Structures are given as C-alpha cells and as structure tokens.
Amino acid sequence: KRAIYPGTFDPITNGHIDIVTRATQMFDHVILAIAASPSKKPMFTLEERVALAQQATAHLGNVEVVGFSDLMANFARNQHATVLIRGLRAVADFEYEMQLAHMNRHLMPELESVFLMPSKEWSFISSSLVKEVARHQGDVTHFLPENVHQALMAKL
Amino acid sequence: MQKRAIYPGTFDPITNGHIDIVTRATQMFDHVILAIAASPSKKPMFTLEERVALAQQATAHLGNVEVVGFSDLMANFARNQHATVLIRGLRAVADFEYEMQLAHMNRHLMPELESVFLMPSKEWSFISSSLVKEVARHQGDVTHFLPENVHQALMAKLAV
Amino acid sequence: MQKRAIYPGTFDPITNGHIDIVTRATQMFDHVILAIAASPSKKPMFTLEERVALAQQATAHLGNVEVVGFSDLMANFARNQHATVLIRGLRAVADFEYEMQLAHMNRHLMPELESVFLMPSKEWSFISSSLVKEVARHQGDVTHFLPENVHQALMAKLAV
Amino acid sequence: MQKRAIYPGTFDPITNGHIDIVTRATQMFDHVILAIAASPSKKPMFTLEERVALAQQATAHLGNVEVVGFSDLMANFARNQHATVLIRGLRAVADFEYEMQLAHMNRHLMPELESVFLMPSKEWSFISSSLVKEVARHQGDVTHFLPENVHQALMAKLAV
Amino acid sequence: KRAIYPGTFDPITNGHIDIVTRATQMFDHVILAIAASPSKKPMFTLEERVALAQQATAHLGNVEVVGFSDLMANFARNQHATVLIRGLRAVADFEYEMQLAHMNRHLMPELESVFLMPSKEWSFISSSLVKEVARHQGDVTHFLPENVHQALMAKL
Amino acid sequence: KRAIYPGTFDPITNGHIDIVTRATQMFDHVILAIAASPSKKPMFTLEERVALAQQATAHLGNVEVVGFSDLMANFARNQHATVLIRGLRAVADFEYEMQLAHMNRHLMPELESVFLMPSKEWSFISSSLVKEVARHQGDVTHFLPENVHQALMAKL
Ligand SMILES: Oc1cccc2nc(CCc3cccc(Cl)c3)[nH]c12
Ligand SMILES: Oc1cccc2nc(CCc3cccc(Cl)c3)[nH]c12
Ligand SMILES: Oc1cccc2nc(CCc3cccc(Cl)c3)[nH]c12
Numbered sequence: 031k032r033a034i035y036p037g038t039f040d041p042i043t044n045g046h047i048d049i050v051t052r053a054t055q056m057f058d059h060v061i062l063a064i065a066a067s068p069s070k071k072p073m074f075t076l077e078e079r080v081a082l083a084q085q086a087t088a089h090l091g092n093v094e095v096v097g098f099s100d101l102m103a104n105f106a107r108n109q110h111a112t113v114l115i116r117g118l119r120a121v122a123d124f125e126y127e128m129q130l131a132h133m134n135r136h137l138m139p140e141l142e143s144v145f146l147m148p149s150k151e152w153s154f155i156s157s158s159l160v161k162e163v164a165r166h167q168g169d170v171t172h173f174l175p176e177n178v179h180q181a182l183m184a185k186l
Numbered sequence: 187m188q189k190r191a192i193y194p195g196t197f198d199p200i201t202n203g204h205i206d207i208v209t210r211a212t213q214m215f216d217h218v219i220l221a222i223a224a225s226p227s228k229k230p231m232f233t234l235e236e237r238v239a240l241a242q243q244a245t246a247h248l249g250n251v252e253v254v255g256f257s258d259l260m261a262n263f264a265r266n267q268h269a270t271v272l273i274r275g276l277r278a279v280a281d282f283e284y285e286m287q288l289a290h291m292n293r294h295l296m297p298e299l300e301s302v303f304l305m306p307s308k309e310w311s312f313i314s315s316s317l318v319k320e321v322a323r324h325q326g327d328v329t330h331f332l333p334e335n336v337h338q339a340l341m342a343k344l345a346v
Numbered sequence: 347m348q349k350r351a352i353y354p355g356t357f358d359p360i361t362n363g364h365i366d367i368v369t370r371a372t373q374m375f376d377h378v379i380l381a382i383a384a385s386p387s388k389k390p391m392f393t394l395e396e397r398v399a400l401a402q403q404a405t406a407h408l409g410n411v412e413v414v415g416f417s418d419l420m421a422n423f424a425r426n427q428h429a430t431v432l433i434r435g436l437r438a439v440a441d442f443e444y445e446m447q448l449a450h451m452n453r454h455l456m457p458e459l460e461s462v463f464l465m466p467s468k469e470w471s472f473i474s475s476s477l478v479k480e481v482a483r484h485q486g487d488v489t490h491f492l493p494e495n496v497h498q499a500l501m502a503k504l505a506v
Numbered sequence: 507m508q509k510r511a512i513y514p515g516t517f518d519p520i521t522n523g524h525i526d527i528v529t530r531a532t533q534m535f536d537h538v539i540l541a542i543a544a545s546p547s548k549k550p551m552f553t554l555e556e557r558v559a560l561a562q563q564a565t566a567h568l569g570n571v572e573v574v575g576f577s578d579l580m581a582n583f584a585r586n587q588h589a590t591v592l593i594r595g596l597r598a599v600a601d602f603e604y605e606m607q608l609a610h611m612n613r614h615l616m617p618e619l620e621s622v623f624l625m626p627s628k629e630w631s632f633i634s635s636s637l638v639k640e641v642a643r644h645q646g647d648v649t650h651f652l653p654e655n656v657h658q659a660l661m662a663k664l665a666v
Numbered sequence: 667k668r669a670i671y672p673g674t675f676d677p678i679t680n681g682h683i684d685i686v687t688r689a690t691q692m693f694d695h696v697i698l699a700i701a702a703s704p705s706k707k708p709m710f711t712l713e714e715r716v717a718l719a720q721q722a723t724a725h726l727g728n729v730e731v732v733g734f735s736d737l738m739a740n741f742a743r744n745q746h747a748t749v750l751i752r753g754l755r756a757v758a759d760f761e762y763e764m765q766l767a768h769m770n771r772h773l774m775p776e777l778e779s780v781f782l783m784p785s786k787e788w789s790f791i792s793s794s795l796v797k798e799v800a801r802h803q804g805d806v807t808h809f810l811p812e813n814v815h816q817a818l819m820a821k822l
Numbered sequence: 823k824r825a826i827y828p829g830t831f832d833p834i835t836n837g838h839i840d841i842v843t844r845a846t847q848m849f850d851h852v853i854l855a856i857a858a859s860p861s862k863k864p865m866f867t868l869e870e871r872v873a874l875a876q877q878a879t880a881h882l883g884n885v886e887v888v889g890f891s892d893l894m895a896n897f898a899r900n901q902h903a904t905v906l907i908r909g910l911r912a913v914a915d916f917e918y919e920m921q922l923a924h925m926n927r928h929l930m931p932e933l934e935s936v937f938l939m940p941s942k943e944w945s946f947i948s949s950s951l952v953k954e955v956a957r958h959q960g961d962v963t964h965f966l967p968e969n970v971h972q973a974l975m976a977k978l
C-alpha cells in the first residue's frame with residue numbers, strides 16, 4: 031500500500047511532519063512529494079526543499095522524499111500510489127481541498143484522497159505564516175525541524 | 187500492514203452516500219467494520235436490527251465489510267475491535283467544525299485511532315439520511331439516493 | 347416571460363427581513379406566491395391561520411403577492427402552482443451548506459424549478475424569526491424587526 | 507477606566523475552556539461577572555445552584571470574578587449590572603454566524619454594551635460542555651477538560 | 667427583463683455555461699459581460715475571452731456577449747439591466763459575493779443581485795483550477811466547451 | 823490599560839474608524855499601528871497612511887497613530903500594550919485571524935487578542951474593495967473619511 035503526500039513544502043514545517051508521521055502509521059510506504067510550484071514563487075528552490083524534507087524525515091524509515099514538476103495525478107500514477115494524503119487544518123482550506131480532490135479523482139479515479147487532521151499544536155500554522163514571522167526576525171524555532179530553522183535563518 | 191478500520195454512524199437508513207464511502211474505505215483498508223450506533227438520543231426511524239439488516243444486504247457484495255451494532259462510546263468500541271483507523275465521510279455540506287471537535291475528542295480518548303476523512307462522489311455530496319427521511323415523510327421521491335432494499339423498507343415504514 | 351415565483355418558509359412570524367426579500371422578488375418576477383408551511387415538526391408560535399393573516403396584512407401594499415398556506419413538500423406545492431422560480435433569502439448568517447443541500451434536493455425533485463438566492467438589506471442580514479421570538483419571550487425589544495401588525499400580534503401572544 | 511465586564515453562558519458544567527476565557531478577561535477588565543443563565547429551554551444536566559457553586563469553587567483563585575445566576579435576557583442583566591463589556595469565547599469550532607447574530611442583537615438591545623471576543627488556548631479550542639457531557643454519559647474520559655470539583659460533581663451526577 | 671452575468675471568464679468554463687443557460691430560462695435577455703480585469707493578469711485578452719464566450723453561447727438565442735472595462739454597476743445601468751447574476755459554488759465564494767453585491771447595491775440600488783447554484787457536475791471547478799491542470803498537460807476536455815479547450819491547448 | 827490596533831490601513835476606511843472608536847470606549851489608550859506591509863505592495867506609502875489615519879482620528883483624544891516595520895508582537899511589547907484589537911467582519915477573515923492571534927500569543931503570551939465586531943453599515947467593506955471601486959471611478963464617499971476620500975481621488 032503506497033500513499034503520496036504532495037505539497038509545496040516551502041519550507042516543510044512541524045505541521046507537515048505531524049501529517050507524514052500519521053500517514054506512515056497507516057500506510058506501508060509514504061512518498062512525500064514536493065511540487066516545483068513556480069506560480070507560488072517559492073522562497074526555497076525545489077532542490078533545497080527536497081534536501082530539507084529528506085533531512086527532516088530521515089528518522090521515519092518508510093518516507094521517500096521526491097520532487098516533481100508534473101501533474102500531481104500523473105506523478106501519483108507513476109509512483110504506483112493509490113492514496114493521496116492531505117492535511118486538514120480549517121474550513122477555508124477544506125473547500126479548495128475538495129476542488130483539488132474532485133479534479134484528481136477525474137484525472138485518476140483509483141487515487142483515493144484522504145484527509146488527516148494535525149495535532150492541536152500545529153492547527154494554526156502554515157509555511158506562509160512561519161516565513162512572515164521569520165522575515166520580521168520573530169522566533170520560529172518551535173514550528174520547524176532544526177535543519178529547516180537553520181536553513182530559514184541562513185536564507186533570510 | 188493488516189489495518190482494521192471502523193466506519194461508525196447511525197445509518198438511519200444507510201444511503202448511496204454511505205455505500206460510496208464504505209466502498210472507498212474497502213479499497214484502501216484490509217478490514218472495514220461498518221459500525222451502527224444504537225443512537226437512542228436522536229430516536230431513529232429504523233430500529234437497530236432493521237438498520238443492521240439493511241446495511242448487511244446493501245454491503246454483501248463487499249467481501250471485507252463486517253456490519254456490527256454498538257451501544258458504547260464509539261472510541262470504546264473501536265478500541266475493543268482493535269481498529270486503528272476511524273473512517274469519516276466528508277460531504278460538501280458537512281459541519282467541518284463538528285468533524286474537527288469529534289476527531290480531537292476521539293484522539294484524546296484513543297490516541298492510537300487515526301481519524302481519516304474520505305470524500306464521496308459529487309453525486310452524493312449534498313445529501314444526508316436526515317434530508318432523505320424528511321423528503322420521503324413529505325411524499326418526495328428519494329429512490330435515487332438509496333440502495334433498492336432500503337427504498338423498499340422505507341416505503342413499507344412510511345406506509346404504516 | 348410571465349414568471350411565477352414561490353417564496354416558501356414557516357414565517358413564524360413574518361419579519362422585516364422576509365418583507366425585504368419578498369419586495370425584491372416582486373421587482374423581478376411577475377407573480378410571487380409567499381407560501382407558508384404548516385411546519386408541524388418545529389411546533390410554531392403562531393398557528394397557520396395567524397401566520398397567513400399576518401403575512402397578508404404585511405404584504406397587502408404589494409400587488410403581485412399572493413399569501414397561501416401549504417402542507418406538502420414544498421417542491422410538490424411549487425409544481426402544482428406552476429412556479430418555475432424558488433426564492434430563498436440569503437442572510438450574512440445563513441447556513442450556506444444547508445441552502446446548497448436544499449437547492450440540490452429541490453432540483454432532484456423538480457428540475458424545472460430554479461432556486462434563486464436574494465440578499466436582504468444589511469439592516470436585516472443578522473436576524474431570524476428564531477432569534478426575534480427568543481428575544482421577545484425573554485422581554486427584549488424586537489419592534490424594529492417586525493411589521494407593526496406582527497409587533498401587535500406578538501405582544502398579544504406573549505401576554506397570555 | 508473602571509470597566510465592568512459580563513461573561514454569560516449556561517456553564518453546564520463549567521469547563522477548562524470557560525476557566526481559560528474568564529482568566530484572560532480578568533487580566534484586561536477590572537471586574538468580571540461570570541453570569542450563569544437559568545437556561546430552562548435546553549434542560550440542563552446541573553441545576554442553577556449546582557452550576558453556580560461549581561463555578562464559584564473553580565474561579566475562587568481569581569479575585570476580580572463574581573459568579574451570579576440570572577433568568578432575564580442577558581442584555582437586561584448586563585444593563586442592571588452596569589456592565590459595558592460582554593465577553594464571548596471564540597473557539598476554533600464556534601458557530602461564527604451565530605456569534606454575529608447574537609452580537610448584533612445585543613447591540614440593538616443595549617448599544618452601550620460592547621461584545622468582545624476572546625480566544626481560548628489551542629488546548630481548549632475544540633471542546634464544548636455539550637461534547638464533554640455526551641462523552642461522559644457514554645463512559646468516556648473527560649477529566650482533562652474539567653476543573654477537579656467539576657470532575658467529582660459530574661462523576662456523582664452520572665453515577666445516579 | 668434584462669439580466670447581466672458579469673465575470674472575468676478567463677476562460678469561460680462549462681460551469682459558466684451552466685449558469686448562463688439557467689439565467690436564460692428565467693430572464694428574457696441575458697448579457698454575458700466580460701470584465702477586462704487587468705489586476706488579475708488574465709491568460710486570455712478581453713477580445714479572445716469575448717470571442718470564446720460568443721462561440722460557446724451561440725446555441726443560446728437570448729445571450730449577448732460583451733466586454734467592459736467600466737465599473738460593473740455603471741455597465742449594468744448602461745445595459746438597462748435590473749438583475750445581476752452570479753453563480754454560487756461554495757462558502758468562501760459566498761462571503762466575497764456578499765461584499766460585491768452590497769457594494770453594487772450602494773452604487774445602483776435597483777440592480778438586484780441574484781445567485782444561481784451550478785449543477786453538482788460543475789460545483790468544484792473554476793477557471794483557475796482548469797488552467798492549473800492544463801499548464802501541467804492534464805486532460806480538461808470534460809470542463810470546457812470544445813472551442814475553449816482548443817484555444818487553451820493552442821495558448822499553452 | 824494600553825491597546826494596539828494594528829493593520830495595513832491602505833487606506834483607513836470608515837470600518838477601521840468604527841473599530842478604533844469602539845476600542846477607545848473600552849481602553850484608556852489606543853495605539854492605531856500601521857504596518858509597512860511591503861509584501862502587500864500598498865497603494866499609499868507608510869508616511870501617507872500614517873498622515874491619513876492621524877487626520878481621520880484627530881477627533882478621538884485617546885488614539886495615537888504610529889507606523890511600524892517590526893514584528894507586530896515586538897512592536898506591541900515596545901508600546902507596553904497588553905491588548906491587541908482586530909475587527910471581525912466574516913468567517914474567512916476569522917480563520918486567518920485565529921492563526922495570527924495564536925502566533926502572536928506564542929511570541930508574546932501576555933498580549934491578549936480581542937476581536938470587535940463592526941457596525942452592520944461597515945460589515946461588507948474592505949480597503950481592497952474600496953480601492954477596486956475607486957479605480958473604476960465609482961463613488962466611495964460613503965465608505966471613507968473626507969481626507970482619505972480626497973487623497974484616494976488625488977492618488978488615482
Ligand atoms: O493533479 C492535479 C490536479 C489538480 C491540480 C493540480 N496541479 C498540479 C500541478 C502540480 C502541483 C502544483 C502545486 C501543488 C501541488 Cl501539491 C502540485 N497537479 C494537479
Ligand atoms: O467516541 C466518541 C467521541 C466523541 C463523541 C461521541 N459520542 C459517542 C457516543 C456513541 C455514538 C453516538 C452517535 C453516533 C455514533 Cl457513530 C456514536 N461516541 C463518541
Ligand atoms: O421540497 C423540499 C425539499 C427538501 C426538503 C423539504 N422539506 C419539505 C417539507 C415542507 C416544508 C417544511 C418546512 C419548511 C418549508 Cl418552506 C417546507 N419540503 C422540502
């Protein structure tokens with residue numbers, strides 16, 4: 031049983047770690063799949079985001095980190111994945127998540143989207159919020175893996 | 187991984203929306219328990235025995251589905267059944283805040299039980315057992331939303 | 347086009363918010379039926395006869411409004427009345443998901459009936475018959491939210 | 507400014523979420539009245555006398571908190587108590603539209619009373635007295651969500 | 667009775683077709699009004715969007731397609747329209763729709779905003795989502811009129 | 823008792839005036855704090871936004887208008903503020919407001935976020951909406967203080 035957890039992960043946060051950890055407790059193999067996402071003009075290059083996520087998930091034996099620029103549904107088919115994991119924080123996210131999941135189902139009917147709920151601890155954070163605080167030199171050590179925090183400090 | 191999943195609800199009665207969710211759950215988990223609550227607080231249209239028999243008949247074609255009634259706190263039942271996955275259907279019209287409250291409470295009660303949210307087909311994304319019953323009680327056509335055995339049982343229930 | 351529109355609800359009692367919606371509906375459709383549900387499930391404060399008389403008096407100045415009671419599934423009543431438009435008021439505080447469920451169910455029941463959502467004035471965007479009744483029962487001033495005849499009827503109802 | 511604030515609710519029973527909100531309110535307002543509604547419509551698990559005593563004991567460490575029962579429209583009670591601030595707790599799972607309806611209605615009733623929304627700790631952002639009671643009635647562990655005196659009272663209530 | 671259905675329509679989708687068709691069953695004349703929308707940096711020029719919508723709605727006799735750069739309320743007044751149609755997909759859209767409708771009411775009190783609900787089939791699609799899938803070469807034939815699909819393929 | 827009311831205020835609207843007025847009826851001193859917000863690419867410079875807000879709030883004796891480029895939580899600590907005011911218009915705003923308030927609480931636990939509800943009159947307006955209408959020469963006199971309206975007319 032192979033699951034894909036796709037996203038921009040710009041950068042990967044403790045919220046993302048929480049979701050991928052939950053996914054590994056449920057599925058045999060989890061592919062953490064980092065989308066290139068040029069339209070979002072990411073802070074970190076795809077190569078940097080992949081390296082950060084690889085380092086942050088090395089303790090989890092059944093996580094494979096990969097980058098992709100393809101249509102997500104095509105990438106999931108090409109990874110032999112039948113489960114698509116997404117984290118569900120709030121209502122505003124849920125509605126866009128429904129659109130994406132219905133589109134993905136149209137593109138690959140056998141790829142089942144599943145939503146996981148993060149810990150209360152990470153229910154109010156996002157990569158965007160963490161970057162905004164860090165741009166103003168605010169302490170974000172609590173929200174990121176150590177290697178990501180260092181990389182964000184170094185980047186800024 | 188030999189995962190056991192539970193899909194709890196009142197299933198009063200079981201709809202095509204519930205069939206769609208339980209079908210999707212069987213494609214990703216080895217064993218799925220469709221767990222029917224006594225749900226005395228709501229005062230159900232169908233008795234637990236009727237709800238169980240309707241659900242067994244409607245899911246008989248799915249080999250890895252077990253239909254079972256329960257009267258305890260769902261988390262207590264999931265624990266006793268050795269389930270590690272809790273299936274929740276998320277319709278386009280679901281109370282998202284309530285689902286969050288429920289999942290956090292279930293996680294407090296049984297941390298080893300993971301809540302997983304599945305999405306039904308667009309076809310069943312706007313219905314509920316509640317709306318189906320209300321429409322049928324008021325002489326509306328609900329055949330499209332139900333398994334054939336459920337349609338027959340509901341017609342018989344409303345006739346008396 | 348000689349469009350017939352229906353504006354259903356419990357109108358228990360009719361408020362300035364309902365008057366605002368029905369007024370807007372008369373400006374765009376030739377004939378508007380303000381359709382009052384028996385709504386026995388909720389157990390209304392005012393009887394159907396009281397609700398109808400209050401609504402007739404409050405809408406008498408609108409020439410193309412017909413106030414009518416109904417006990418069937420609203421879609422069944424809209425079909426029998428040859429209505430092709432179903433008016434729903436959408437307040438800033440409406441249950442959007444419920445409105446979607448209702449409109450899709452109404453479309454399944456009668457495809458030729460189009461649900462149209464109208465927006466009330468900002469003035470009435472945060473009230474409901476439910477909140478108005480609760481406030482009045484608890485000795486609060488609701489005069490501002492009601493037609494004068496409704497204010498008089500509600501005071502008389504609460505006095506006994 | 508010698509501000510008097512009111513924090514109304516049914517507190518059936520008072521939870522750690524309510525304690526968190528009332529604590530935050532005492533840090534910004536000089537006097538906080540924790541106002542317990544008779545709330546007969548809901549039919550509460552605990553009587554008003556039980557709810558008041560539980561809340562007094564759970565807030566005794568907060569010097570500027572006064573626990574008081576009330577049976578009038580909350581706005582009528584706030585007016586008589588010379589309160590100019592109305593505390594509302596806003597959980598991650600609150601009915602935002604309902605809070606808006608309530609605040610606008612309270613502003614219509616008493617314009618000099620300002621509704622202020624406080625946010626509880628992430629720890630209590632997904633609970634309610636309703637969910638806590640439901641879980642406890644169904645043999646679930648709710649100790650974590652309640653003050654110790656409330657936990658003892660709830661166990662005694664459910665035992666009989 | 668004249669109704670205006672305004673939007674960016676970048677490009678027009680089957681969801682938009684569904685709404686305009688419903689609008690023609692209710693009102694005598696429907697103006698499908700395409701806003702220039704430079705702030706949104708559209709994929710298609712106004713002239714292209716107008717031509718695509720004209721071709722896509724030619725089967726509906728009481729639809730007139732027009733482009734505009736004016737304040738929408740002024741354009742509706744200038745078209746003698748008294749009805750403003752908008753499609754209502756989800757909660758997140760509904761709130762911004764309320765702001766726009768209350769502003770339009772302030773600008774032109776007699777222009778009544780009316781919301782129509784799309785078919786379940788088109789309830790999870792948007793021009794943005796279709797463009798995102800098409801940018802990654804994903805199949806969008808199901809969501810667009812034939813002429814629009816060809817034009818989107820040709821544009822990309 | 824010192825409260826801070828932070829925001830981009832690009833430009834300050836009658837909705838913002840309504841909130842700051844409510845805040846002064848509750849707290850002894852209110853700092854209306856204008857964030858530089860370069861990421862939002864504001865129409866008005868920080869100096870212009872500060873001057874507009876100063877003029878618009880001069881009638882309120884206990885309002886101090888200040889600009890800032892710092893982390894908001896650091897600025898609140900540096901202003902000796904213990905209350906953070908935000909206006910709550912709708913559901914979509916509420917969710918992002920929760921994230922910001924939980925982050926601010928992590929950065930400064932003693933700074934209490936409080937939400938105030940605007941008048942029905944201003945419940946559907948925003949700086950963005952007012953600028954959009956004004957860009958198309960629509961009448962926005964009703965939504966802005968006189969000095970702001972003149973400045974917006976002059977800017978456009
Ligand atoms: O399969 C898909 C269906 C619908 C839209 C989609 N957009 C893509 C492009 C890749 C991408 C971009 C941003 C973020 C991610 Cl996780 C992936 N694939 C999609
Ligand atoms: O595990 C739980 C956690 C929180 C609340 C819940 N209430 C129950 C009681 C049983 C019940 C009632 C209605 C429907 C079902 Cl599926 C089950 N279990 C829950
Ligand atoms: O056409 C309908 C479709 C779906 C559900 C609905 N329930 C009814 C029953 C009648 C009713 C009850 C309360 C209020 C009114 Cl306005 C009407 N009609 C509906």
Ligand SMILES: Oc1cccc2nc(CCc3cccc(Cl)c3)[nH]c12
Nearest residue numbers: 484514515543578579580581611612
């Ligand atoms: O001032 C008010 C305005 C609007 C509605 C309200 N309903 C009441 C009645 C009393 C009550 C009932 C339940 C819970 C409480 Cl805290 C108070 N007061 C309200």
Ligand SMILES: Oc1cccc2nc(CCc3cccc(Cl)c3)[nH]c12
Nearest residue numbers: 672673701703737738739769770958
């Ligand atoms: O009448 C109006 C009221 C409020 C805002 C408005 N913005 C405009 C500009 C034209 C425009 C831009 C984008 C999309 C459309 Cl459909 C129209 N008119 C407006």
Ligand SMILES: Oc1cccc2nc(CCc3cccc(Cl)c3)[nH]c12
Nearest residue numbers: 166828829857859893894895925926
């Ligand atoms: O304390 C904070 C916590 C979380 C995010 C934050 N972003 C900032 C930067 C300043 C800023 C930018 C835009 C708008 C405002 Cl009101 C303030 N401070 C923050």
